From Swiss-Prot:
The lineage of its organism: Eukaryota, Metazoa, Chordata, Craniata, Vertebrata. Oligomerizes and associates with TNKS2. Interacts with the cytoplasmic domain of LNPEP/Otase in SLC2A4/GLUT4-vesicles. Binds to the N-terminus of telomeric TERF1 via the ANK repeats. Found in a complex with POT1; TERF1 and TINF2. Interacts with AXIN1. Interacts with AXIN2. Interacts with BLZF1 and CASC3. Interacts with NUMA1. This is Poly [ADP-ribose] polymerase tankyrase-1. Zn(2+) binds at residues 131, 134, 139, 142. Poly-ADP-ribosyltransferase involved in various processes such as Wnt signaling pathway, telomere length and vesicle trafficking. Acts as an activator of the Wnt signaling pathway by mediating poly-ADP-ribosylation (PARsylation) of AXIN1 and AXIN2, 2 key components of the beta-catenin destruction complex: poly-ADP-ribosylated target proteins are recognized by RNF146, which mediates their ubiquitination and subsequent degradation. Also mediates PARsylation of BLZF1 and CASC3, followed by recruitment of RNF146 and subsequent ubiquitination. The chain holds residues 1104 to 1314 of 1327 of the full protein. Phosphorylated on serine residues by MAPK kinases upon insulin stimulation. Phosphorylated during mitosis. It comes from Homo sapiens (Human). It is found in: Cytoplasm; Golgi apparatus membrane; Cytoplasm, Cytoskeleton, Microtubule organizing center, Centrosome; Nucleus, Nuclear pore complex. Residues 9-207 form the PARP catalytic domain.
Amino acid sequence: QGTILLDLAPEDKEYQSVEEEMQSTIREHRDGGNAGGIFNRYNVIRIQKVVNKKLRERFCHRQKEVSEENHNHHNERMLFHGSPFINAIIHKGFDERHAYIGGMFGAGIYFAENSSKSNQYVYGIGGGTGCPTHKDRSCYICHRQMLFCRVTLGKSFLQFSTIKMAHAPPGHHSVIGRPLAYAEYVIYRGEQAYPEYLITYQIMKPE
Ligand SMILES: [Zn+2]
C-alpha cells in the first residue's frame, strides 16, 4: 500500500545518468548564492527510485488523458523539483492544493531543468530559514533532498514574464516561463508529475 525506495548502485548507468543531469545543469544564480548556498558541485549521498502503485496509476491515468487531448503526445520531460514537501510527495504524490510558490491566490507546482534552481526552494521560498538544525541556507553539513521527476507537459503555454496564472490556458496542460534567468515548468495538477528519483545530497564548499 506504500512506497518502496529502491537504492541505485553508483556503478549503474542509471545512477550515473541522474547525477550527470544533476551536476551538469548547475548554473550561477543572480542571488550570489543567497537562497540555495554557495557551491559549484554537489556531494551526492544516495539516489533512490520511488515506487508506489497508487502514485503510478494516477500518473498513467492522467498521461493517457493528456495524450488524447494532445494528438497522442503526452510530452513528458525529466525535470527537477525542490520543496520542503519532499517526504509527503514520495508517499502521497504531488498535490497542487499546496500552493508552495504561488500563494493564497496563486497556484501551480514548479519544476526546473536546472538542478541548482530547484535547490533554492529545498528549504522554502528564498531558501526559507535554511536547514532545520543550523538555520543556514548555505549548510554544507546537512543532507538535502530533491526529486528528478517525470512530468507530463502536454501542450505547453510559453511565457516570458514576471506574471503567473492559476490554471493552464485553454487547450494547454502546462506553462513554461522562459528566460528570467532560467526556465521554469508549471503544472496545475499533481498527477501530471511522478517523483521518479529521490536524490539525497550536500552542496559542496569551494576550496
Ligand atoms: Zn545544517
